[PDB]
Amino acid sequence: DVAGAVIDGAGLGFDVLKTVLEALGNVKRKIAVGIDNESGKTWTAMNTYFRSGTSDIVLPHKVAHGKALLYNGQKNRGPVATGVVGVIAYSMSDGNTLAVLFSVPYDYNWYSNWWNVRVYKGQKRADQRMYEELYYHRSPFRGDNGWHSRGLGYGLKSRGFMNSSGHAILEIHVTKA
């Protein structure tokens, strides 16, 4: 039930994610990510690229079909005005990559919460380029208190939800299209 964990997908929900978030203590910018694997593919962790902020969670290595991964992130230490922005990358047993963008900005006068889910062909580790694609070019969803669904190609689709505040919860379910 903690952030390093792989749980039964059916157990991924708001209450698991609220506890994962509050477990981070009182930081200005922080995020709880839950990703439910119902894609039929087995996911193996590659990496998280942090554009901003950090985590000391070991990215859950093996997420089989019907299993959810729990994860978290937070802004960098010190009196800096940055948020927590990054991309998570999982290789799937079909040879492709599941990439997940999350963006929790510091300045809510100029920016918003964003998230994205994309399938890449082959095994692409998360990096600055992938961040730019997911954030700037691939029509990311807004942390706008709304559910957003989209086909990913490769016989899959994603469904996610993200709140608007600097204490963010991102809930994603990857299923077959």
UniProtKB/Swiss-Prot annotation:
Keywords: Cytolysis, Ion transport, Lipid-binding, Membrane, Nematocyst, Secreted, Target cell membrane, Target membrane, Toxin, Transmembrane, Transport. An N-(acyl)-sphingosylphosphocholine 2 binds at R51, S52, G83, Y106, Y111. An N-(acyl)-sphingosylphosphocholine 3 binds at W114, Y135. Has been engineered for DNA analysis in nanopore technology. One of its GO terms (cellular component) is nematocyst. The keyword Secreted applies. Residues 1-27 are annotated as: N-terminal alpha-helix that contributes to the pore. Residues 103-118 are annotated as: Trp-rich region, which is important for the binding to lipid membrane. Its main location: secreted. Pore-forming toxin (PFT) that consists of a crown-shaped octamer or nonamer that forms cation-selective hydrophilic pores of about 1.5 nm (inside) and 13 nm (outside). It causes cardiac stimulation and cytolysis (EC(50)=1.6 nM on erythrocytes). Interestingly, the Phe-14 is crucial for hemolysis. This is DELTA-actitoxin-Afr1a. It comes from Actinia fragacea (Strawberry anemone).
